[PDB]
Structures are given as C-alpha cells and as structure tokens.
Design brief:
Structural class of chain A: mainly alpha
Strand content of chain A: under 5%
Distance between the termini of chain A: 43 Å
Chains: A mainly alpha (about 170), B mainly alpha (about 675), C little secondary structure (about 10)
Largest sheet of chain B: 6 strands, mixed
Structural class of chain B: mainly alpha
Shape of chain B: elongated
Largest sheet of chain A: none
Oligomer: part of a larger assembly
Largest interface: B-D, 74 and 62 residues
Strand order of the largest sheet of chain B: 2-1-3-6-7-8
Number of helices of chain B: 34
Order of helices and strands of chain A: HHHHHHHHHH
Radius of gyration of chain B: 34 Å
C-alpha cells in the first residue's frame, strides 16, 4: 500500500498534465498531508501541492489555492520533524506571495521567524522580507522589532554562536 | 466539433425572476445605534498635593520624580505651584472636553469636597460627572476604604470614606485615582456598591473607574518620568508617549534624538498636517484599533463610542497600561479591559513615531518642510490586500477603524471611500461591521461637501447602507442629505450605473416616511424622474418608476404635482417595454397613483379611468410577475370605489364591468399566485 | 457634535 | 375595507439587487467553476449522442420491431415527447405528466398540470433541450406553463412560469435558437410569444374559418407552416405585414390535417397528412405538390422524423405502418393509437394505444 504512494505523488507533479481535473487531486492531497504517520507521504505531498497550484482570474481556483496554502503553511510551522518544516517553507515561492500577504498567513510566517532550528529562521526572514513591499503595514513593524532583537543579540550576548547567527540573519 | 451550436443558444426562462422567488429579504434586527448618548457635563479636580510636605509613608529619593502636570512645584514656592497645577490640569482636560464646568479643589477640606461634589450633582442632574482625585501629598489610602484630604489649618490629614464620596457624587459618574495603592480604592468602591444594593432591598453599573496602580503596588519614583504618571498618560498621551519613546533602547537606532528635541516638536494637536498633529492623529487611530480588535462589541461601544471624554480617557488608558507596565505598575479599570500591552498594533506606533521624529533634526535646524507619514497610506494598503481574497467570513479586517480616521481629512479621502465601497460591497454582513465601527455619522457629514469627485463614491456607499438599513431615512432627511442625491439624479453626465443607485436611494428615503415624501416632493423630484424615465438603462427606468411609485403613496399633494406634470401620461410608455421588471414598476406606480384621492370630482375620476383602461391591457402579459402587480393596482382602485363594484358584482350572480372582467381572467389564471391573490381581492367585493 | 473632527 | 390592499414583494425583491455584490467575475464565466464543467460535460455528452444518431441514419434504415419496454400508465397516453439527450420520455394525459425511462426502465416522476376537469394537455415541448432543460405544457383552453426539476433525485415538481395564450385545442412550436414560441388553435390568429421579452410580438391573421390543427416553423428563412381543419395548408413569412402575410394557400386535402411538418434544411419540405390518410410533399416556392402518396384509409395520429425522413402512421384498425418519405414499406406492426413520437436525433419510435400502454421501438 505505502511505498507506491510516494512514487505516485512524485509522478503527479513531476511531468506535465493537461487536465483541469488536477483541482480534485490537490484537494484529495489534503488527506495525504494531514494524516500519514509515515513521514515520506507528507514530505512529498508538500512538494506536489506547491507544484500543482501554478494556475494561481476567476473565483474557484482562488478559494482552492487559499484553502491549500493555509493547510500547507500550517505544516510548515507546526510539523514536529524539521525536514518537512524546511521543505514546505522553501517551496512557498514568489508565485504565491499575494496569498501569503493576507493577515492570517502572515501571522503564521512570523512564528516561523523565531523557530527552534536556525536554517528555517534564515528562510522565513527572506520570505517575510520579500512580502514587505506587498503588505507593508503588517510586515514593516514586525521587521523593525526583529532588527532591534538582532542588534541586541550582537552587542549584549557574550556567546559567539549567537552573534555569528545574529549577524548572518 | 458539435460544441459551438451548444454554447450559442438562448436559455429561455433561466434568470433571477424565474429561479429565485419574487420575495422582501428578511431584514435583520440591526443593532448598530447608540441611542444611549451620554454626555460628560462637569468635572471635579480634587487635588491633594501639599507642596514641599512629603507624607510619612513614602520617603522619597534625592533625584525623585518631582514633575506634576509638567511643572516642578518646588521651583515656584507652594501656593503659586498649586494654583498653576490646577490651571494646567484643567487645560489638559480642555483638549479632550472643552465644554464642561471645571471646578478644581486645591488641598481641600472634607466639607469643601462635600459642597463641591453635591453642587456638581445639582448642575449635571442626570448626566456624567468626572471626579479626578490626585493624592501625592497625602498618605496612601487605607484598607478601611478611606482616602485622605486635609483639615482647615493644614495640620492633620483627615480621612474621607469612599461610601460618603459615592453618596455625594451621583450614579452616572467616573473616577480617576492617581495615588499609590489605588487598587484599594477600586476594590472598596465595588464593595460599598454591593453594600448599597443589599441594604436597599431591606451605582456600580453606571460608575466607571480608572486607577493608577494595583492595591499592592507603589507608583514609580523614577527621576525622568513625571510624578503625575497615570494622569499625564490619561490626559497628555502624546507628550509622555514621545518622552517614553526616548527613554527606551529603541532610540539606539534613531541617532540624534534627545529629550530637548521632543520639547520643540513643531505643530499642535488639531492641525493634522504638522508633525505633532500627525503623531496625534496616528495615535488615535492606533488606540481605537487596539480597542476594536480586542474588546467584545457591546463593551467597545459602552466605552469608546458613547461619550467623548470617557472614550478619550480609555483610548489614552491603553497607553498607560503599556507604559506603567515597564515600571512594575499595572493600572486598573472598573469595566475591566483585557491586557493590550502586547498587541501588535503598538509596534506600528513605535515605527510610526520612529520615522516621524528621525525626520526632526532636519526640520528643526535647517527648515526642511514636513514630509507626511506613510502610516495611513500603508494601513489603507493592508485593508486593500484583505479585500482581494477576503470575501470570506473569517477574521474581519484589523484596519476597519483606521479607514474611518482617514475619512476625516482631504489627503486620503478618495482612496478610503473607494475601499469603503469595495468593502460594503461584499454583503449585508460587511455593512453591519462598518455601521458598528461607527462609520455612519462621518459618511452622512460628507453629504454637506461639494467636491465633485465624491459624488460617485458617496452614492455608492449610501446605496449599500440603505439596502441593509431602511430606517436611516430618518437621518438623511434631517440634514438635507436628500438634496445631495436629488442633484446627482438631475445630472445628465453622471454615468447610468450610479444614477440608478441614486434613484434607488431616493426610493428608500421616500418609502412610507411622510416627512421624507414632503421633502423630496418640494425638491422637485417628480420633474427630475420624468426627464430620466425614458433612458437606455433598464434598471434606471425600473427604479425611477419606483420613485414616482413611492412618492405618491397615501400622499395627495404628490398626486397634484403629478397631474400638473402629466406623470401618468408619460408612464404609459413603460407599460409596453421590453423588460418585465420595468413593466412591473410602471404598473406598481400607476396603481399607487390611483390608491389615494380624498374623493375628488372630474379630473381625479377621468384620469383614474384612463389609468385603469391602460392597465386593463396588461392581462395578455407574459410574466405573472406583471400580473401580480396588475392585480395589486386594481386592488387599490377597488378599495376606493367599493360602492360601484358592490352593485356591479351583485348584478352578475361599461368601465367597472370591464375591470371586473379583467379580475375574472386574473382569478381564472394558470399560474397559482396570480389566481390566489385575484380571488382574495374579488372575495373582498363578494 | 461628532466624536472625531471632520474637516470638510 | 382598506385591509383588501395587498402589497407584493417586488419592490423589496428589487432592493435585494443592492445587498448582493457587483464587482467580481460572475459564477458562469469562471472556466474552472463546477457548474460550467458540468454544463460542458452535458454538452460533450450531447455532441456524442448527435454523432451516434447520425451513424445509425447512415447505415440505411432496415426493419423495426425492437420493443425496449412495455409499461402501462394510470391514464390514456395523449402526447409523448423524447428529451433530446437524457433518456426522459414525458408521456402526459388529460391532467398528469408521467416521466418514464427506457434504459433503466422506470417511473421517475408524476405531476398534475393544475388544470380543470374539462381541460386536456394537447401539446408539449422541451425548452432548453441542450442543458438545464424545462418542460412546456400547453393545455387546450389556452394555458401554457413551464416546469423545472422534472426527473430529479433530490427535488419535486417546480412550475417556473405560466401564462394564457389565446381565447383541435392548442398547438405549439418552440424555436430554441430564436427564443420564440408560436401558439395557435381554435382561433383565427397565430400569436408569437417572445420568451425573453415575455410579450406577444406579432399576431398573424390566419385567413381561415376552421381551427389550426398543426403548426411547424422555420428559423433562418422565417416560414410559419399551419395546417387547418377544413383541409388547406398555409405558409406565412413573418417579415412582411399582416395584410400581406399569406405567402401560399394550396389545398389538395379535406379533413383534420393531423400533421403538416417542416424540415430544417434549405431544401424545405412540408409533409401534410389528412384524416383520409394521404401524404403530399410540398415546396414553399411552388403552388402544387412535388410527390404524392396514399398510405392508411382511416388514419388517427402520425409522427415524422427530424434527421432521417421516416413517417410513422397510426390507424383505426390497430396497425402501425412505418414508411419512408419516398413511400416505401419497412414495417406494418400488428397490435385510437393517439401518440407516436420520434427522437430528435436517434431513429427510436414511441407508440401509445387507447388502452393504457406505452412502447418504444428501435432499428437495432
């Protein structure tokens, strides 16, 4: 049952279909994502559903795209394993950022901005940074406070690792 | 392929009149009003501050906080200082409320306070009375529920029971305590309130309170803040907001900003286009936002909208809660707010200020002209971003009270009113939201404007509002708001799209509201309609017909001005129109024309029979919709001339016989609705 | 007597 | 006295225009909307059905006895109609409308027309035959009416609209492409109800005392054909004035002309049949007949096919003769056979006897 799903999902994204019918496939990929106690169905369902939503005008595609990104981005912040949290956030391209600009999506990305793992933070600062043109009223303040926290880390922490990571960020 | 024949065919009987039922929309119990319009009438400034005499509780520091309404009292000699501080404290409340009696009491006796509070009762009599109590001069208030004042000779601190105080003050009231353990005063007040109710059955609802500090805590002694810290926040927010900005580690990244520069920020707190006014304007928007996104709707209304002074105090109290936190205090409030110190709209203020006074040495040395803040622009941008996707009923938009603030200027009014249209767009729910945030009186006031760019955008809003809330017809007729719209409907150059809405607005204003029927008549609406009656836009013909329709419902004067303009004559063209809706409206109007009369002789009767004869050739009409309305029109005629149709009916068991014949063809109808209602009318004769 | 100042 | 004043919810319904949104793209244009996809799927299914029918016509129509089913209604079958693409066969009577299936073989629905006891459903049509179809139901007294949700799973009968046209019975001719519906009958008028405008456009005078027994029309080149009770067959071009209207009046029959019917070709043919039971193929450009045939002695009801040129007769003596337009014999099936009905596309023939039974035949 299980190891086949990985290659099926890889196929679904990795060569070019000419069916609208994909819109059902992406919404059924909400099942694969949320569940799958198997790590690999998740990490691949991610990498699929980012790829399939490239039609991101009219009002059906839009609700679908937005419905996915919520579920998709949830995993990018919330998922316990770091590797999925990296994969999801990295796949949220420039293609989407008019959906990431919404308050709610953006509130979630800021949680990523102070993650457990360093590499994810480095990613999220880049992401939020891209959007600071798009929806500046939310972003620009958060980024200012982030800047202050950063300069505080530089001056006042005696640890080298922290300063290193701080300057890098 | 055989798909091009398919897509290119007229689908008959698949439109709104067919699929949907011809019914009204069940309008909601719209509870957006503040009919509870309180007004703070008078103010007591009891101000125990025995200058140069530190009470035995707090042994103060060497460089302590010696400021006190932006005055060092010790620099002046005692009596001058105390009088001056009363003057300043009054000036600070005058910003927020300039039309109140300010009876300041300076180092007062018990009896003095009694005279004062009771006197202010008899003045204000049912309406809200402020009682500011400072108490830096006196010892800290006791667990007994006693607060301290003086005796006549200034030897002894006399106590003053809170029970006695709320005896003398009335129930609609509001207290501000700025003294060290002020939580104890809050607690004791709420206890002595219960004690009244329990003893009564053998206040608190109406009493608001604000208190500098919790019952445990002591106020700060910190040399660079003022000793008046809770008062100063409450009633000079921008002045401490800026000074407190300057004391943080935030200023590390605004180099060349000292406290001296903040003394001389140019502008004032009313001229919006000058750095001080700008910051003030921003501040207001921010605090109003933090309240509207945090508090439950009922409570938000109670505090932030009901009356000016209380609203100003609670807006500013949010700032106090944020500052005093950083010095181990917590302020207290009688309607207990949630904690708002962390709320992210503060970090907007922080940036807004940063920009708006990093730009300050360049102003104040060279004379570089003032460049406005991006705040309102960017904040409107966010609101725009939310409208794109967010037609949803998800979390509503955080910026909604900021949009309201932006309407108050020229600078961004056009952008805001468009965005407010594009929001009120989305349904009746969004109109319910914008009416709750208090958009209504600000929009209504813009009708008094004459900037020609607003005419499409106000029309567009007023359309969407009056769809949802028909009871706003009261407000528009009071202010001569109707004349604004009458002039838009008179314009031949304003596009058909918006003139449609204008006609609709005028229908709502006029709809069974007698004063509104009178006003719009005497603004020459019958002439305006009949010019636009024969347009090429079928909604407009429909709605402009409905205007005429509503304007002479049960209103005889409108019928007279109708007959002098030959309105009924001109309306006969719309009876053979290519859209049913236009015909419905036309029929509707010609019916309600007939419906009122007050028994007039030749002209009324002659005209009525001509109208009836012309309506009588709508029996062979396709839409039952028209035929329903047709039966209604004839029903109005029936209700007047009952004596005639009684005779004509009782015969069969020229003119009236034909009307009765029509009602038979309408009673014996293939569509059920038409047959039903035709039979109801004919049963009323029977 | 509106709550905020409207400059029309 | 004043309590007799009713107020319709039109002006309040109209006000709902402004509560609803304006700015966004409508739900149909949206290329990835489910409704449009279902519509497109329906249209694809329609095109397939058209092709299949065409293929059956190209094989050269052989003999024809194949009974797909026999059921029996609660009433006498009066008129029968085949929905073009879905297998829904509406078989109305004096009052009701039974909807039978011929692939499953099932009763789907049952209406009441809402008409009195004296009245009878003379004619019927299928409006919007291509997608989201409706059912027009012309009663003999004058009443027309339209039905939605006629053989649906989660729904019951819904009457869309209904209106008196007029005052043989009534006769109707829908024109899906033009938007027009022409009513005629006992009167000396052929009304033309536009269904977009919902008004009687033209009222063409017949110039004939007797009743209009059949009615059939042309799009592209406007030609209202109307056979009559005294025997004659008129043709009217609606472009000209009402004093001029009579293009042709050629009369080579005598009786209730059971059916005059017009082909949708630029080679237009009028196949007229009297109670005496004899076909005469006419042209609109000639004063007399091109071909001549004598078929059944006592003809009762008749149907003629759209795509192929089949004629399916009835008889007083129980026979069901199914010939070509050339006059050639194919079948004479041995049982008031008062309702025969072809498919618009496939070569399927329904029949309904005076006894309460239905059949559907097919050419393999």
């Amino acid at each position: 049952x299980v190891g086949s799903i990985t290659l099926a999902l890889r196929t679904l994204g990795s060569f070019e279909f000419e069916g609208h019918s994909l819109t059902q496939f992406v919404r059924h990929c909400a099942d694969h994502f949320l569940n799958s106690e198997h790590k690999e169905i998740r990490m691949e369902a991610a990498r699929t559903c980012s790829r399939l939503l490239t039609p991101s005008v009219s009002q059906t595609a839009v609700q679908v795209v937005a419905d996915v990104l919520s579920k998709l981005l949830v995993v990018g912040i919330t998922d316990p394993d770091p590797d999925i949290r990296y994969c999801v956030l990295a796949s949220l391209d420039e293609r989407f950022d008019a959906h990431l600009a919404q308050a709610e999506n953006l509130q979630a990305l800021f949680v990523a901005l102070n993650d457990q793992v360093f590499e994810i933070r480095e990613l999220a600062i880049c992401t939020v940074g891209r959007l600071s043109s798009m929806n500046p009223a939310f972003v620009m303040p958060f980024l200012r406070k982030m800047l202050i926290q950063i300069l505080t880390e530089l001056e006042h922490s005696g640890i080298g690792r922290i300063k290193e990571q701080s300057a890098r960020m | 392929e055989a798909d091009l024949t398919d897509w290119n065919l007229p689908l008959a009987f698949m439109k709104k009149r067919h699929c949907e039922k011809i019914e009204g929309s069940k309008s909601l119990a719209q509870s957006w009003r503040m009919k509870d319009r309180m007004k703070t009438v008078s103010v007591a400034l009891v101000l125990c501050l025995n200058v140069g005499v530190d009470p035995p509780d707090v042994v103060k520091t060497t460089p302590c906080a010696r400021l006190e309404c932006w005055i060092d009292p010790l620099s002046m000699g005692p009596q001058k200082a105390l009088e001056t501080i009363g003057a300043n404290l009054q000036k600070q409340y005058e910003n927020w409320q300039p039309r109140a009696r300010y009876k300041q009491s300076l180092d007062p006796t018990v009896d003095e306070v009694k005279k004062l509070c009771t006197s202010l009762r008899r003045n204000a009599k049912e309406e809200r009375v402020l009682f500011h109590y400072n108490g830096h001069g006196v010892p800290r208030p006791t667990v007994n529920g006693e607060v301290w004042v003086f005796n006549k000779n200034y030897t002894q601190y006399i106590p003053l029971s809170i029970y006695d105080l709320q005896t003398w003050m009335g129930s609609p009231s509001i207290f501000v305590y700025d003294c060290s353990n002020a939580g104890l005063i809050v607690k004791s007040f709420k206890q002595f309130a219960l004690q009244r109710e329990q003893e009564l059955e053998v206040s608190m609802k109406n009493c608001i309170q604000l208190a500098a500090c919790e019952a445990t805590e002591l106020l700060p002694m910190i040399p660079d803040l003022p000793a008046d810290l809770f008062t100063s926040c409450l009633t000079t927010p921008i002045k401490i907001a800026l000074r407190w900005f300057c004391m943080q580690k935030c200023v590390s990244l605004v180099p060349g900003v000292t406290l001296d520069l903040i003394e001389k920020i140019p502008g004032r707190l009313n001229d919006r286009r000058t750095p001080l006014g700008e910051l003030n304007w921003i501040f207001t928007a921010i605090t109003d936002t933090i309240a509207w996104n945090v508090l439950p709707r009922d409570l938000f209304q109670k505090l932030f909208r009901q009356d000016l002074l209380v609203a100003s105090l609670f807006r500013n109290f949010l700032l106090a809660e944020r500052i005093m936190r950083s010095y181990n205090c917590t302020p207290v409030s009688s309607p207990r707010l949630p904690p708002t110190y962390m709320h992210a709209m503060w970090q907007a203020w922080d940036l807004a200020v940063d920009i708006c006074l990093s730009q300050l040495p360049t102003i104040i040395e060279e004379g570089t002209a003032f460049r406005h803040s991006p705040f309102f622009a960017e904040q409107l941008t966010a609101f725009q971003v939310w409208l794109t996707m967010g037609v949803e009923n998800r979390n509503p938009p955080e910026q909604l009270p900021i949009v309201l603030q932006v309407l108050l200027s020229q600078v961004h009014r056009l952008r805001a009113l468009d965005l407010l249209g594009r929001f009120l767009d989305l349904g009746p729910w969004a109109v319910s939201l914008a009416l709750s945030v208090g958009i209504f009186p600000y929009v209504l006031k813009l009708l008094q404007s004459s900037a020609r760019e607003l005419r499409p955008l106000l029309v567009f809003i007023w359309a969407k509002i009056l769809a949802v809330d028909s009871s706003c017809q009261a407000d528009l007729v009071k202010d001569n708001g109707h004349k604004y719209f009458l002039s838009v409907l008179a314009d031949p150059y304003m596009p058909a799209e918006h003139r449609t809405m204008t006609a609709f607005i005028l229908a709502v204003i006029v709809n069974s509201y007698h004063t509104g029927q009178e006003a719009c008549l005497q603004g020459n609406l019958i002439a305006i309609c009949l010019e636009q009656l024969n347009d090429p836009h079928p909604l407009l013909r429909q709605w402009v017909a409905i205007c005429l329709g509503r304007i002479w419902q049960n209103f005889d004067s409108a019928r007279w001005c109708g007959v002098r303009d030959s309105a009924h004559e001109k309306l006969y063209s719309l009876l053979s129109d290519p859209i049913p809706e236009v015909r419905c409206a036309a029929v509707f109007a010609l019916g309600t024309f007939v419906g009122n009369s007050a028994e007039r002789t030749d002209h009324s009767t002659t005209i009525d029979h001509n109208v009836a004869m012309m309506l009588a050739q709508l029996v062979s009409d396709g839409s039952p919709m028209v035929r329903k309305e047709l039966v209604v029109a004839l029903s109005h005629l029936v209700v007047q001339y009952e004596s005639n149709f009684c005779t004509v009916a009782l015969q069969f068991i020229s003119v009236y016989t034909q009307i009765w014949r029509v009602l038979l063809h309408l009673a014996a109808d293939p569509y059920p609705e038409v047959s039903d209602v035709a039979m109801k009318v004919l049963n009323s004769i029977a | 007597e509106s709550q905020f100042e409207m400059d029309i | 006295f004043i309590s007799a004043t009713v107020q319709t919810g039109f002006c309040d319904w109209s006000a709902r225009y402004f509560a609803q949104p304006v700015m966004k793209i409508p739900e149909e244009h949206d290329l990835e909307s489910q409704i449009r996809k279902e519509r497109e799927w329906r249209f694809l299914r329609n095109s397939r059905v058209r092709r299949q029918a065409q293929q059956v016509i190209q094989k050269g129509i052989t003999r024809l006895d194949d009974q797909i089913f026999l059921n029996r209604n609660p009433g006498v079958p009066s008129v029968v109609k085949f929905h073009p693409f879905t297998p829904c066969i509406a078989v109305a009577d004096k009052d009701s409308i039974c909807f039978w299936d011929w692939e499953k073989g099932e009763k789907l629905d049952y209406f009441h027309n809402g008409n009195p006891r004296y009245t009878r459903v003379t004619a019927m049509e299928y409006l919007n035959g291509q997608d989201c179809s409706l059912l027009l139901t012309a009663t003999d007294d004058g009443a027309i009416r339209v039905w939605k949700n006629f053989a649906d799973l989660e729904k019951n009968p819904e009457m869309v609209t209904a209106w008196q046209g007029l005052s043989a019975g009534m006769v109707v001719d829908w024109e899906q492409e033009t938007g027009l519906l022409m009513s005629s009958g006992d009167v000396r008028i052929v009304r033309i109800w536009d269904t977009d405008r919902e008004m009687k456009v033209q009222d063409i005078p017949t110039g004939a005392d007797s009743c209009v027994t059949s009615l059939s029309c042309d799009s592209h080149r406007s030609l209202i054909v109307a056979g009559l009770g005294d025997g004659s067959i008129r043709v009217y071009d609606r472009r000209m004035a009402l004093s001029e209207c009579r293009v042709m009046t050629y009369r080579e029959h005598t009786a209730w002309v059971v059916k005059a019917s017009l082909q949708k070709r630029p080679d237009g043919h009028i196949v007229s049949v009297s109670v005496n039971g004899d076909v005469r193929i006419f042209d609109p450009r000639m004063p007399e007949s091109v071909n001549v045939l004598q078929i059944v002695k006592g003809l009762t009801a008749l149907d003629i096919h759209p795509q192929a040129d089949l004629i399916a007769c009835g008889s007083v003596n129980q026979f069901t003769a199914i010939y070509n337009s050339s006059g050639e014999l194919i079948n004479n099936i041995k049982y008031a056979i008062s309702c025969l009905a072809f498919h618009p596309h496939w070569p399927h023939l329904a029949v309904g006897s005076n006894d309460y039974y239905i059949s559907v035949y097919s050419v393999e």
